[PDB]
Paper text:
N-methyl-d-aspartate (NMDA) receptors (NMDARs) are ionotropic glutamate receptors (iGluRs) that mediate most of the excitatory neurotransmission in mammalian brains. NMDARs are formed from two obligate GluN1 subunits and two of any GluN2(A-D) or GluN3(A-B) subunits. The GluN1-3 (A or B) NMDAR emerges as an exception, distinguished by its distinctive ion channel activation mechanism, which relies exclusively on glycine and does not involve glutamate. In these NMDARs, glycine binding to GluN3 promotes channel opening, whereas glycine binding to GluN1 triggers rapid desensitization.
We initiated our single-particle cryo-EM on GluN1a-3A NMDAR bound to a competitive antagonist, CNQX, to capture the inhibited state. The wild-type (WT) human GluN1a-3A NMDAR displays rapidly desensitizing currents upon glycine stimulation. As in other NMDAR, AMPA, and kainate receptors, we observe domain swapping between the ATD and LBD layers, and pseudo-fourfold symmetry in the central channel pore formed by the M3 helices. We observe prominent density, consistent with CNQX, in the glycine binding pocket of the GluN1a LBD. While CNQX has been previously shown to bind the isolated GluN3A LBD, we do not detect a discernible CNQX density within the ligand-binding pocket of the GluN3A LBD. This absence may be attributed to low occupancy or poor local resolution.
Numbering used by the authors:
A (entry chain D): 926 to 955
B (entry chain D): 740 to 768
C (entry chain B): 740 to 913
D (entry chain A): 628 to 698
E (entry chain C): 550 to 579, 628 to 798
Write the structure that this text describes.
Amino acid sequence: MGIKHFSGLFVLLCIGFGLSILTTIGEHIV
Amino acid sequence: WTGRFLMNLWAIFCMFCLSTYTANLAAVM
Amino acid sequence: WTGRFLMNLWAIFCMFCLSTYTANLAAVMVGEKIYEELSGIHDPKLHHPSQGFRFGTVRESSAEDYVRQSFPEMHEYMRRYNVPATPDGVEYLKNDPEKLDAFIMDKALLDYEVSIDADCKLLTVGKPFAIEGYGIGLPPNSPLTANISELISQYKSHGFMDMLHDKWYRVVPC
Amino acid sequence: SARILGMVWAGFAMIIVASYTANLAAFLVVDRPEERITGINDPRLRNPSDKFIYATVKQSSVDIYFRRQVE
Amino acid sequence: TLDSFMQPFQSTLWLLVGLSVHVVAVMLYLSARILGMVWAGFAMIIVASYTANLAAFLVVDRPEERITGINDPRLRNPSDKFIYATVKQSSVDIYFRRQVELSTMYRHMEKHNYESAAEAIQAVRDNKLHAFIWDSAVLEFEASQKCDLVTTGELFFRSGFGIGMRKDSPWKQNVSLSILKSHENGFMEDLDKTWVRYQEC
């Protein structure tokens, strides 16, 4: 399950980074 | 003082939790 | 450059050391079985005295008379270590504190008296030396001096001792 | 000597933490008491103790048969 | 010992960690606090997982090698990695054609088989077979001089090397008397020390 957990962690990290970038872009003009 | 004590307590709790998690992961292996 | 190389070397060394320590601890906690070790009869552990051990036997019994008159240097080094009976002997060693630490007595009784003690604290050690053999003693030339002989030979050859020897010397894992 | 003492103390703390973690993991792996009694040939069911007083209703079917076996 | 670090396929984990670190650096270059916290947590979790996996791998060691007895599990269905050879045309073959239960056992002993002790014990060194079945004293001796292979296992099928004598021969008793009086008087042990066991091993 180690590979599965690592893939899940990577997916969660990517989603979090994308959401943070979008929020920062939105608040930059806000 | 208060902040240092709170940080130390949080560190101790986190270390205990990490040890417990590692032990559980080893046990489930 | 130099700082990055130093940091990388330090981190790699710390990680490898932590992994090695974890492996060593796993090996140390994953198994342990040592006890003592005796090679045989000739080992200087008892053949060469070392400040007064116990290694007792059974007074005037079967197997003491061997060391009575084959290694005639150390009978005084038994004398104060011979409790009379067998079973009180075998418990005289287990109920620590230490009172005795080795024991010389015929094999069969020993191998029985290790196999009803689930505490598993005991074990046969070393390789056999010398020999004896049990038997049935009869008066001076009674008529049944051979009928028993042929009969018991037939019994043994038949496959009858196996039934018994299974029935009693049960080997249960501790 | 402050820097050297601090580095040594940090190393000692890390070593203590690693040893504690190793012991905890080993203890967690070890714990497995279970082992219910099984049958007619068991170390628990071959010798007496005080923690295993087992009985049977007296003078009844079982107890009579369960007495003749000299073995 | 501790050498199979790369055998554990740690290369894939190292490559994944490197790619994730590069991705984190790119994202921080392109909010940085959240990504840094995520990377630190991932590093700690990966460290814990690597330690746990290393401990689990250290637990496994493929123990219980060698052999225990004649009724132990391995000696009842030899697949291809325990082709043990007796010494056909001996007493041993006869004793494996008269014990009924051992039938299946015997069958595979009539696969690859030898015609002398010498080539056999040599082949033990040649590392093809992983056993041998042949009487006691010869075995312990051979193990002693050619200190290459250690005896093992228990004993079975007991017996005794008597001294044979013709039926109701004139000396039918006195040899028995002398052999007993010696056999307790520390003689056989002396001879056994001086002839049957050596200490080069």
